[PDB]
Coordinates of C-alpha atoms and ligand atoms in Angstrom, one line a residue:
Chain Y
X1 CA 43.0 -70.9 -25.3
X2 CA 41.1 -71.5 -22.0
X3 CA 42.7 -73.0 -18.9
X4 CA 40.6 -74.0 -15.8
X5 CA 42.4 -74.0 -12.4
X6 CA 40.4 -76.0 -9.8
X7 CA 41.4 -75.7 -6.0
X8 CA 40.0 -76.5 -2.5
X9 CA 39.8 -80.3 -2.5
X10 CA 40.9 -82.6 0.3
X11 CA 40.0 -85.0 3.2
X12 CA 37.5 -83.9 5.9
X13 CA 35.4 -85.3 8.8
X14 CA 31.7 -85.9 8.0
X15 CA 29.9 -82.6 9.2
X16 CA 32.9 -80.6 7.9
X17 CA 33.1 -77.9 5.2
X18 CA 35.3 -77.2 2.0
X19 CA 35.2 -74.4 -0.6
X20 CA 36.1 -75.6 -4.2
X21 CA 37.1 -72.8 -6.6
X22 CA 37.7 -72.8 -10.4
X23 CA 39.3 -69.7 -12.2
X24 CA 39.1 -69.8 -16.1
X25 CA 41.9 -67.9 -17.9
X26 CA 42.3 -67.0 -21.6
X27 CA 40.9 -64.4 -24.0
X28 CA 37.5 -64.7 -22.3
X29 CA 34.8 -62.2 -23.1
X30 CA 32.1 -64.2 -21.2
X31 CA 30.9 -67.6 -19.9
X32 CA 27.2 -68.5 -20.1
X33 CA 27.3 -71.0 -17.1
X34 CA 29.9 -72.2 -14.5
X35 CA 29.1 -75.5 -12.8
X36 CA 30.4 -78.3 -10.6
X37 CA 29.9 -82.0 -11.5
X38 CA 31.1 -85.0 -9.5
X39 CA 31.8 -88.6 -10.3
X40 CA 32.0 -91.1 -7.3
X41 CA 34.1 -94.3 -7.9
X42 CA 32.5 -96.5 -10.6
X43 CA 29.3 -94.3 -10.9
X44 CA 28.0 -91.8 -13.5
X45 CA 29.0 -88.0 -13.5
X46 CA 26.1 -85.9 -12.0
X47 CA 25.4 -82.1 -11.8
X48 CA 26.1 -80.8 -8.3
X49 CA 25.5 -77.0 -8.9
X50 CA 25.6 -74.4 -11.7
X51 CA 25.2 -70.5 -11.9
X52 CA 24.5 -68.5 -15.1
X53 CA 26.0 -65.0 -15.8
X54 CA 22.8 -63.5 -14.4
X55 CA 23.0 -65.4 -11.1
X56 CA 20.3 -68.1 -11.9
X57 CA 21.5 -71.0 -9.6
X58 CA 20.7 -74.8 -10.0
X59 CA 21.4 -77.5 -7.4
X60 CA 21.2 -81.3 -7.3
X61 CA 18.5 -82.2 -4.6
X62 CA 21.1 -84.1 -2.4
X63 CA 23.1 -80.9 -1.8
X64 CA 20.3 -78.2 -1.6
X65 CA 20.6 -76.3 1.7
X66 CA 24.2 -77.7 2.3
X67 CA 26.1 -76.4 -0.7
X68 CA 26.2 -72.8 -2.2
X69 CA 27.6 -71.9 -5.6
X70 CA 28.6 -68.3 -6.3
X71 CA 30.4 -66.5 -9.1
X72 CA 32.7 -63.5 -9.7
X73 CA 31.8 -62.6 -13.3
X74 CA 34.8 -60.2 -13.8
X75 CA 37.4 -62.8 -12.6
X76 CA 35.7 -65.7 -14.4
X77 CA 35.8 -67.6 -11.1
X78 CA 33.1 -69.9 -9.5
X79 CA 33.0 -71.1 -5.8
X80 CA 31.3 -74.1 -4.2
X81 CA 30.8 -73.7 -0.4
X82 CA 30.3 -77.3 0.8
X83 CA 28.8 -77.6 4.3
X84 CA 27.6 -80.6 6.4
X85 CA 29.7 -82.9 4.1
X86 CA 28.6 -86.6 4.1
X87 CA 30.5 -89.8 3.0
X88 CA 28.2 -90.0 -0.1
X89 CA 29.7 -86.6 -1.2
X90 CA 33.1 -88.4 -1.8
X91 CA 34.0 -88.0 -5.5
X92 CA 36.1 -86.2 -8.1
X93 CA 34.6 -82.7 -8.6
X94 CA 34.9 -81.1 -12.0
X95 CA 34.2 -77.6 -13.1
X96 CA 32.5 -76.8 -16.4
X97 CA 32.8 -73.4 -18.1
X98 CA 29.7 -73.9 -20.4
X99 CA 29.3 -71.4 -23.3
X100 CA 32.7 -69.8 -23.1
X101 CA 33.1 -67.0 -25.6
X102 CA 36.8 -66.2 -26.5
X103 CA 37.9 -63.5 -29.0
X104 CA 41.1 -61.8 -30.2
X105 CA 41.4 -58.1 -31.3
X106 CA 41.6 -59.5 -34.9
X107 CA 38.0 -60.7 -34.5
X108 CA 38.9 -64.5 -34.6
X109 CA 37.3 -66.4 -31.7
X110 CA 35.6 -69.5 -30.4
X111 CA 32.4 -70.6 -28.4
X112 CA 33.1 -73.8 -26.5
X113 CA 32.6 -75.8 -23.3
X114 CA 35.8 -76.3 -21.2
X115 CA 36.4 -78.8 -18.2
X116 CA 39.0 -78.8 -15.4
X117 CA 41.1 -81.9 -14.7
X118 CA 39.1 -82.7 -11.5
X119 CA 39.8 -82.3 -7.7
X120 CA 39.4 -85.1 -5.1
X121 CA 36.9 -84.6 -2.2
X122 CA 36.9 -87.4 0.4
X123 CA 34.5 -87.4 3.5
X124 CA 35.5 -89.8 6.3
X125 CA 32.5 -91.1 8.5
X126 CA 34.6 -91.1 11.8
Chain M
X1 CA 45.5 -75.6 -49.6
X2 CA 45.4 -71.8 -49.9
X3 CA 46.1 -72.4 -53.7
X4 CA 42.6 -73.8 -54.6
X5 CA 40.7 -70.9 -52.8
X6 CA 42.8 -68.1 -54.4
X7 CA 42.3 -69.4 -58.0
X8 CA 38.5 -69.9 -57.6
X9 CA 38.4 -66.3 -56.0
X10 CA 39.8 -64.7 -59.2
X11 CA 38.6 -67.6 -61.7
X12 CA 34.9 -67.1 -60.6
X13 CA 34.4 -63.9 -58.5
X14 CA 37.3 -62.0 -60.1
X15 CA 39.2 -60.6 -57.0
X16 CA 43.0 -60.5 -56.6
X17 CA 43.0 -60.7 -52.7
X18 CA 40.4 -61.0 -49.9
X19 CA 39.2 -57.5 -48.7
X20 CA 40.7 -58.2 -45.2
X21 CA 42.8 -60.9 -43.4
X22 CA 39.6 -61.7 -41.3
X23 CA 37.4 -62.4 -44.4
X24 CA 40.2 -64.8 -45.6
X25 CA 40.5 -66.7 -42.3
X26 CA 36.7 -67.1 -42.2
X27 CA 36.5 -68.4 -45.8
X28 CA 39.4 -70.9 -45.0
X29 CA 37.6 -72.1 -41.7
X30 CA 34.4 -72.8 -43.8
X31 CA 36.6 -74.6 -46.4
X32 CA 38.2 -77.1 -43.9
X33 CA 34.6 -78.1 -43.1
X34 CA 35.5 -79.4 -39.5
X35 CA 33.7 -76.7 -37.4
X36 CA 30.4 -74.8 -37.4
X37 CA 31.1 -71.1 -38.2
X38 CA 29.6 -67.7 -37.2
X39 CA 30.4 -64.7 -39.4
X40 CA 29.4 -61.2 -38.1
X41 CA 30.6 -58.7 -40.8
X42 CA 29.0 -55.5 -42.1
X43 CA 26.8 -56.0 -45.3
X44 CA 28.9 -56.5 -48.5
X45 CA 30.6 -59.0 -50.8
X46 CA 33.0 -60.2 -48.0
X47 CA 30.2 -61.8 -46.0
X48 CA 28.5 -63.7 -48.9
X49 CA 32.0 -64.9 -50.2
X50 CA 32.5 -66.8 -46.9
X51 CA 29.8 -69.4 -47.9
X52 CA 29.6 -68.9 -51.7
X53 CA 33.3 -69.5 -52.5
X54 CA 33.4 -72.6 -50.2
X55 CA 30.1 -73.8 -51.7
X56 CA 31.8 -74.4 -55.1
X57 CA 35.0 -76.2 -53.9
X58 CA 32.7 -78.4 -51.8
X59 CA 31.9 -81.1 -54.4
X60 CA 28.4 -81.2 -53.0
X61 CA 25.2 -79.0 -52.7
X62 CA 25.2 -76.0 -50.3
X63 CA 21.6 -75.2 -49.0
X64 CA 21.2 -71.4 -47.9
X65 CA 18.3 -70.5 -45.7
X66 CA 17.3 -66.8 -46.2
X67 CA 14.2 -65.0 -44.8
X68 CA 12.5 -63.5 -47.9
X69 CA 12.5 -63.9 -51.7
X70 CA 13.8 -60.2 -52.3
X71 CA 17.2 -61.1 -50.7
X72 CA 17.3 -64.6 -52.4
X73 CA 16.6 -62.9 -55.8
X74 CA 19.5 -60.3 -55.4
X75 CA 21.9 -63.2 -54.9
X76 CA 20.7 -65.9 -57.4
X77 CA 20.8 -63.1 -60.1
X78 CA 24.4 -62.1 -59.0
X79 CA 25.6 -65.7 -58.8
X80 CA 24.0 -66.4 -62.3
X81 CA 26.0 -63.5 -63.9
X82 CA 29.2 -65.4 -62.5
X83 CA 27.9 -68.5 -64.5
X84 CA 27.2 -70.4 -61.1
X85 CA 24.7 -73.3 -61.1
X86 CA 22.3 -71.7 -58.5
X87 CA 18.5 -72.3 -57.9
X88 CA 15.7 -71.2 -55.5
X89 CA 12.8 -73.1 -53.8
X90 CA 9.7 -71.1 -52.5
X91 CA 5.9 -70.9 -53.0
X92 CA 6.3 -68.1 -55.7
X93 CA 8.0 -70.8 -57.9
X94 CA 5.6 -72.3 -60.5
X95 CA 4.2 -75.8 -59.8
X96 CA 6.1 -77.1 -63.0
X97 CA 9.4 -75.1 -62.2
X98 CA 9.1 -76.8 -58.7
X99 CA 8.6 -80.4 -60.0
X100 CA 11.7 -79.8 -62.3
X101 CA 13.9 -78.6 -59.4
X102 CA 12.8 -81.4 -57.1
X103 CA 13.6 -83.8 -60.0
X104 CA 17.1 -82.2 -60.4
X105 CA 17.8 -82.8 -56.7
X106 CA 16.5 -86.5 -56.8
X107 CA 19.0 -87.0 -59.7
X108 CA 22.4 -88.7 -58.9
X109 CA 24.9 -85.8 -59.3
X110 CA 22.4 -82.8 -59.7
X111 CA 23.4 -79.5 -61.4
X112 CA 22.2 -77.2 -58.5
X113 CA 25.4 -76.3 -56.7
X114 CA 23.8 -73.7 -54.3
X115 CA 20.1 -73.9 -53.3
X116 CA 18.5 -70.8 -51.7
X117 CA 15.4 -71.7 -49.6
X118 CA 13.1 -69.9 -47.1
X119 CA 12.9 -71.0 -43.4
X120 CA 9.3 -72.4 -43.7
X121 CA 10.2 -74.8 -46.6
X122 CA 13.6 -75.8 -45.0
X123 CA 11.5 -77.1 -42.0
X124 CA 8.2 -78.1 -43.8
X125 CA 7.3 -81.8 -43.9
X126 CA 7.0 -81.6 -47.8
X127 CA 10.8 -80.9 -48.1
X128 CA 12.3 -83.4 -45.5
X129 CA 12.4 -86.4 -48.0
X130 CA 14.5 -84.2 -50.5
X131 CA 16.8 -83.1 -47.6
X132 CA 17.1 -86.8 -46.3
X133 CA 17.9 -88.2 -49.8
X134 CA 20.6 -85.5 -50.3
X135 CA 22.0 -86.5 -46.9
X136 CA 21.9 -90.3 -47.6
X137 CA 23.7 -89.7 -51.0
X138 CA 26.4 -87.6 -49.1
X139 CA 25.5 -84.7 -51.6
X140 CA 25.0 -82.1 -48.7
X141 CA 28.3 -80.0 -48.3
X142 CA 27.0 -77.1 -46.1
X143 CA 23.8 -75.7 -44.5
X144 CA 24.0 -71.9 -44.4
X145 CA 21.7 -69.7 -42.3
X146 CA 21.8 -66.0 -43.5
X147 CA 20.3 -63.3 -41.3
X148 CA 21.1 -65.5 -38.3
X149 CA 20.1 -62.7 -35.9
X150 CA 16.5 -63.2 -37.0
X151 CA 16.4 -66.2 -34.6
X152 CA 16.7 -63.8 -31.6
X153 CA 13.8 -61.9 -29.9
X154 CA 16.6 -59.5 -28.5
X155 CA 17.4 -58.6 -32.2
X156 CA 15.5 -56.1 -34.4
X157 CA 14.1 -58.6 -37.0
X158 CA 12.7 -61.6 -35.0
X159 CA 11.1 -64.2 -37.3
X160 CA 9.3 -67.2 -35.6
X161 CA 10.1 -69.4 -38.7
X162 CA 13.8 -69.2 -37.6
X163 CA 13.0 -71.2 -34.4
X164 CA 12.5 -74.4 -36.5
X165 CA 16.1 -74.3 -37.9
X166 CA 17.5 -75.8 -34.7
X167 CA 15.9 -79.3 -35.3
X168 CA 17.4 -79.3 -38.9
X169 CA 21.0 -78.9 -37.7
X170 CA 21.2 -82.4 -36.1
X171 CA 19.6 -84.1 -39.2
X172 CA 22.4 -82.5 -41.3
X173 CA 25.0 -83.7 -38.8
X174 CA 27.4 -84.8 -41.6
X175 CA 27.5 -81.2 -43.0
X176 CA 28.9 -78.0 -41.3
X177 CA 26.5 -75.2 -40.5
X178 CA 27.5 -71.5 -41.3
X179 CA 25.5 -68.7 -39.7
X180 CA 26.0 -65.1 -40.9
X181 CA 24.7 -61.7 -39.9
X182 CA 25.8 -58.0 -40.1
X183 CA 24.5 -57.1 -36.6
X184 CA 24.7 -59.2 -33.3
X185 CA 25.3 -58.1 -29.7
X186 CA 26.8 -60.8 -27.4
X187 CA 23.2 -61.7 -26.3
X188 CA 22.0 -62.1 -30.0
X189 CA 25.2 -64.3 -30.6
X190 CA 24.2 -66.6 -27.6
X191 CA 20.6 -66.9 -29.1
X192 CA 22.1 -67.9 -32.5
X193 CA 24.5 -70.5 -31.0
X194 CA 21.7 -72.0 -28.9
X195 CA 18.6 -71.8 -31.2
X196 CA 20.5 -73.0 -34.4
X197 CA 22.1 -75.8 -32.2
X198 CA 25.6 -75.0 -33.6
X199 CA 28.2 -77.8 -32.8
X200 CA 31.0 -76.6 -30.4
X201 CA 33.6 -75.5 -31.0
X202 CA 32.0 -72.7 -33.1
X203 CA 34.6 -70.6 -35.0
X204 CA 33.7 -66.9 -34.8
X205 CA 34.8 -64.2 -37.3
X206 CA 33.4 -60.8 -36.2
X207 CA 34.6 -57.6 -37.8
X208 CA 35.7 -55.3 -34.8
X209 CA 34.3 -51.7 -34.3
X210 CA 37.7 -50.2 -33.5
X211 CA 39.2 -47.4 -35.6
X212 CA 42.7 -46.2 -34.6
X213 CA 42.2 -42.7 -36.3
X214 CA 39.2 -41.6 -34.0
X215 CA 39.8 -39.7 -30.7
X216 CA 36.7 -40.1 -28.5
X217 CA 35.9 -37.9 -25.5
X218 CA 33.0 -36.9 -23.3
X219 CA 32.5 -33.4 -21.9
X220 CA 30.0 -32.6 -19.1
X221 CA 27.8 -29.7 -20.2
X222 CA 27.0 -29.2 -16.4
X223 CA 30.8 -28.2 -15.8
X224 CA 30.9 -25.7 -18.8
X225 CA 29.8 -22.0 -18.4
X226 CA 30.5 -21.3 -22.2
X227 CA 29.0 -24.3 -24.1
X228 CA 28.8 -22.6 -27.5
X229 CA 32.4 -21.4 -27.0
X230 CA 33.6 -24.9 -26.1
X231 CA 32.0 -26.3 -29.3
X232 CA 33.5 -23.5 -31.5
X233 CA 37.0 -24.2 -30.1
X234 CA 36.4 -28.0 -30.7
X235 CA 35.2 -27.4 -34.3
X236 CA 38.2 -25.0 -35.2
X237 CA 40.8 -27.4 -33.6
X238 CA 39.4 -30.4 -35.6
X239 CA 39.3 -28.3 -38.8
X240 CA 42.6 -26.6 -39.8
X241 CA 44.8 -29.6 -38.9
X242 CA 46.5 -28.6 -42.2
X243 CA 47.8 -25.0 -41.3
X244 CA 49.0 -24.2 -44.8
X245 CA 45.7 -25.3 -46.6
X246 CA 44.2 -23.2 -43.7
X247 CA 40.7 -24.6 -42.8
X248 CA 40.6 -28.2 -44.2
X249 CA 37.7 -30.8 -43.9
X250 CA 34.1 -30.7 -42.6
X251 CA 32.2 -31.6 -39.4
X252 CA 28.8 -32.8 -38.1
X253 CA 27.0 -31.6 -35.0
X254 CA 24.1 -34.0 -34.0
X255 CA 21.1 -32.8 -31.8
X256 CA 17.9 -34.5 -30.6
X257 CA 15.5 -31.5 -31.4
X258 CA 15.0 -29.2 -34.5
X259 CA 15.0 -26.0 -32.2
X260 CA 18.5 -27.1 -30.9
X261 CA 19.7 -27.6 -34.5
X262 CA 18.6 -24.1 -35.7
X263 CA 19.9 -22.4 -32.5
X264 CA 23.3 -24.2 -32.5
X265 CA 24.0 -23.4 -36.3
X266 CA 23.3 -19.7 -35.5
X267 CA 25.6 -19.7 -32.3
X268 CA 28.4 -21.4 -34.3
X269 CA 28.0 -19.0 -37.3
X270 CA 27.9 -15.8 -35.0
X271 CA 31.3 -17.0 -33.5
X272 CA 32.8 -17.3 -37.1
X273 CA 32.2 -21.1 -37.8
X274 CA 29.9 -21.4 -40.8
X275 CA 27.1 -24.0 -39.9
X276 CA 23.6 -24.7 -41.3
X277 CA 20.8 -26.6 -39.6
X278 CA 19.5 -29.8 -41.4
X279 CA 16.2 -31.4 -40.1
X280 CA 12.9 -32.9 -41.3
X281 CA 11.2 -29.5 -40.6
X282 CA 13.0 -27.9 -43.7
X283 CA 11.5 -28.4 -47.2
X284 CA 13.2 -30.9 -49.6
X285 CA 14.7 -28.0 -51.8
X286 CA 16.3 -26.5 -48.6
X287 CA 17.6 -30.0 -47.5
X288 CA 19.3 -30.5 -50.9
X289 CA 21.0 -27.0 -50.8
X290 CA 22.3 -27.6 -47.3
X291 CA 23.5 -31.1 -48.2
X292 CA 25.1 -30.0 -51.6
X293 CA 26.7 -27.0 -49.8
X294 CA 28.2 -29.4 -47.1
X295 CA 29.2 -32.1 -49.7
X296 CA 30.8 -29.5 -52.0
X297 CA 32.7 -27.9 -49.0
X298 CA 31.0 -24.4 -49.3
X299 CA 29.7 -24.6 -45.6
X300 CA 32.1 -26.6 -43.5
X301 CA 29.8 -27.7 -40.6
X302 CA 26.2 -29.2 -40.7
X303 CA 24.0 -29.3 -37.5
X304 CA 21.5 -32.2 -38.0
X305 CA 19.0 -34.5 -36.2
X306 CA 19.1 -38.3 -36.7
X307 CA 17.3 -37.3 -40.1
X308 CA 20.7 -36.7 -41.9
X309 CA 20.4 -38.9 -45.0
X310 CA 23.6 -40.9 -46.0
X311 CA 22.9 -40.9 -49.8
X312 CA 26.7 -40.8 -50.2
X313 CA 29.3 -40.6 -47.4
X314 CA 32.2 -38.1 -47.0
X315 CA 35.8 -39.1 -46.5
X316 CA 37.1 -35.8 -45.0
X317 CA 34.7 -35.5 -41.9
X318 CA 37.2 -34.3 -39.2
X319 CA 34.8 -34.2 -36.3
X320 CA 31.4 -35.6 -35.1
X321 CA 30.0 -33.8 -32.0
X322 CA 26.9 -35.1 -30.3
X323 CA 25.3 -32.1 -28.6
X324 CA 22.8 -34.6 -27.1
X325 CA 23.4 -38.3 -26.0
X326 CA 22.0 -40.7 -28.7
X327 CA 19.0 -43.2 -28.2
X328 CA 21.5 -46.2 -28.4
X329 CA 25.2 -47.2 -28.5
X330 CA 24.6 -48.5 -32.1
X331 CA 23.2 -45.1 -33.0
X332 CA 26.2 -43.2 -31.4
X333 CA 28.7 -45.7 -33.1
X334 CA 27.1 -45.3 -36.5
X335 CA 26.8 -41.5 -36.2
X336 CA 30.3 -40.9 -34.6
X337 CA 31.7 -43.4 -37.2
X338 CA 30.8 -41.0 -40.1
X339 CA 34.1 -39.3 -39.1
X340 CA 37.6 -40.0 -40.5
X341 CA 36.7 -42.4 -43.4
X342 CA 39.9 -41.2 -45.2
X343 CA 42.1 -42.7 -42.4
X344 CA 43.4 -39.2 -41.2
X345 CA 43.0 -38.2 -37.5
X346 CA 39.4 -37.2 -36.5
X347 CA 37.5 -36.3 -33.2
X348 CA 34.3 -37.8 -31.8
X349 CA 32.9 -35.8 -28.8
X350 CA 29.8 -36.5 -26.8
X351 CA 28.5 -33.5 -24.8
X352 CA 26.8 -35.4 -21.8
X353 CA 24.2 -34.0 -19.3
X354 CA 22.3 -35.9 -16.6
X355 CA 19.3 -33.7 -17.7
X356 CA 19.7 -35.2 -21.4
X357 CA 20.0 -38.7 -20.0
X358 CA 16.8 -38.5 -17.8
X359 CA 14.9 -36.9 -20.8
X360 CA 16.0 -39.6 -23.4
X361 CA 15.6 -42.5 -20.8
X362 CA 12.0 -41.2 -20.3
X363 CA 11.2 -40.8 -24.1
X364 CA 12.4 -44.4 -24.9
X365 CA 10.1 -45.6 -22.1
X366 CA 7.2 -43.7 -23.7
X367 CA 7.8 -44.8 -27.4
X368 CA 8.1 -48.4 -26.1
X369 CA 4.8 -48.3 -24.2
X370 CA 3.2 -46.8 -27.5
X371 CA 4.5 -49.8 -29.5
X372 CA 3.5 -52.3 -26.7
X373 CA -0.2 -51.2 -27.3
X374 CA 0.2 -51.5 -31.1
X375 CA 2.2 -54.8 -31.4
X376 CA 2.3 -56.2 -27.9
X377 CA 5.1 -57.0 -25.3
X378 CA 8.4 -58.3 -26.7
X379 CA 12.0 -59.0 -25.4
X380 CA 13.3 -56.6 -28.1
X381 CA 11.8 -53.6 -26.1
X382 CA 14.2 -54.5 -23.1
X383 CA 17.1 -54.6 -25.7
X384 CA 16.2 -50.9 -26.7
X385 CA 16.5 -49.9 -23.0
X386 CA 19.8 -51.9 -22.5
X387 CA 21.1 -50.2 -25.7
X388 CA 20.8 -46.8 -24.1
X389 CA 22.3 -48.0 -20.7
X390 CA 25.5 -49.0 -22.5
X391 CA 25.8 -45.3 -23.7
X392 CA 24.9 -43.8 -20.2
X393 CA 27.6 -46.1 -18.8
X394 CA 30.0 -44.9 -21.6
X395 CA 29.6 -41.2 -20.4
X396 CA 29.4 -41.8 -16.5
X397 CA 32.3 -44.4 -16.1
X398 CA 36.1 -44.3 -16.0
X399 CA 37.6 -46.6 -18.7
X400 CA 38.7 -46.6 -22.4
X401 CA 35.9 -45.3 -24.7
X402 CA 36.9 -47.7 -27.5
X403 CA 36.7 -50.6 -24.9
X404 CA 33.1 -49.6 -23.7
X405 CA 32.0 -49.6 -27.5
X406 CA 33.9 -53.0 -27.9
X407 CA 32.2 -54.5 -24.8
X408 CA 28.7 -53.4 -26.1
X409 CA 29.2 -55.1 -29.6
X410 CA 31.1 -58.1 -28.2
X411 CA 34.6 -57.2 -29.5
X412 CA 37.9 -58.0 -27.6
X413 CA 39.8 -55.2 -25.9
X414 CA 41.0 -52.8 -28.7
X415 CA 44.5 -51.3 -29.1
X416 CA 43.4 -47.7 -27.9
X417 CA 47.0 -46.1 -28.1
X418 CA 46.0 -42.8 -26.2
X419 CA 43.0 -42.7 -28.6
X420 CA 40.4 -41.5 -26.1
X421 CA 40.3 -39.0 -23.2
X422 CA 40.7 -41.7 -20.4
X423 CA 43.7 -43.5 -22.1
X424 CA 45.6 -40.1 -22.7
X425 CA 45.0 -38.8 -19.1
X426 CA 43.1 -41.0 -16.6
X427 CA 43.3 -38.5 -13.7
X428 CA 41.8 -35.6 -15.9
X429 CA 38.7 -37.7 -16.6
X430 CA 38.6 -38.9 -12.9
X431 CA 38.8 -35.2 -11.8
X432 CA 36.1 -34.3 -14.3
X433 CA 33.8 -37.2 -13.0
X434 CA 34.6 -36.2 -9.4
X435 CA 33.5 -32.6 -10.3
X436 CA 30.2 -33.9 -11.9
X437 CA 29.6 -35.7 -8.5
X438 CA 30.0 -32.4 -6.5
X439 CA 27.5 -30.7 -9.0
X440 CA 25.0 -33.6 -8.4
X441 CA 23.0 -31.4 -5.9
Ligands
ZN1 ZN1 41.2 -45.5 -24.8

């Protein structure tokens, strides 16, 4: 079934930039929404950004104007351009493939949400 | 296991095997009772079997939401003949019949095995106690929503009542929900999954479009100096695929206008292919002669508008030529699909013209504006326009023809096997498309 490959995590200076990416693979016809969530140490998972097939975008207030989500519908890939990174952005970032429609030529398929394993983003104040 | 299902398939419905391996898998997935299920199969016994058979092995009551009494009646009657303990709940039921049924369902171990019900009642305050008590007493085995597409404004049969069915799903948490329809695009599927609040992962069983025995191609009328000649050659090649039987099988040519139908039948006949026009303009007596003559194989080719009645189908149709692009991909699929029912090789050709595209594009816009005055603005109107664009894309793009049809309906990539013009010679189609581009002035 569906595998999510996340990439682009690491350690940067405050004021720096990263680009997270997440490719979904499998017998994928479509994905309703691709999204980035983050969980800082001992804190609740929150929505960072999400984009429908359609291109309707949705950002957490704390990242509006700093972060840009974009999607390649044909490659089932989502991107998060992170600029002007701050210490408070330090967290494990997860991708969500919401409303993933998979199907075989036999006509058997599934509609499910899938999550990646998570990628560490660390922003140093220095 | 498999054992329990197979016995009760013969023992009650009297069938040796499931019609298809897909119908079997669906039925089994509903039986396990671990997943919400979505069945998209063309109308027939197969579909209904996917919830009816499991309803009996369940050891509890299956509630089936259906949009109107007519459809409920067909089914209760058919289930009754199989000596199945089935009942209906609706306003048309007598006050006393009603009080009796409600009493039966309040009873520990009721006789009702399958209850058919309308969307208004299923959601009405008056019925919630009954639903709750059935849930409490773990007597609810399945909630089935038939005609699931009705929940979608992007579908053809939108019913506001179906918007209440979402809230019900959570209340019936314990029980799996089965949603069935004959007709759903990817967009209608999404509306069903969301509006009925199906629990993920949803198991999907969707009968694919693909037919290995149909060769699809598009020809650009703009690049052809002898159109009537090109069609004659196409007709004769498709017929006489059995050289010793001579000319074997029949064909259909579809046209938008009545003038086009009359004219094309004459141009084919004058070149030695016997064809008769069939359209709404002819009297009923004429229509019956033309149809009889075609069905009886006296006249091998019929040139028709969308008007062509499907009273009975024909297995030996060897070709379906569209002289004009259809209104919609569903129209084209259904019309082209009247070919090759016997399993033997058949040809589906679309004669495309940017002039035809522009004209049909425009006519759809006008018939939509006419309905917008009568019945008001709807999301369904935009589905009508997207339905044409899938066919325009089919003609004007490089790629497998069977794939483009699969994409529109929400099927996986089909096993084309040099079964369209693109898959048999990509460069040919590229060259033809390149040429159409030079002609664009
Ligand atoms: Zn192909």
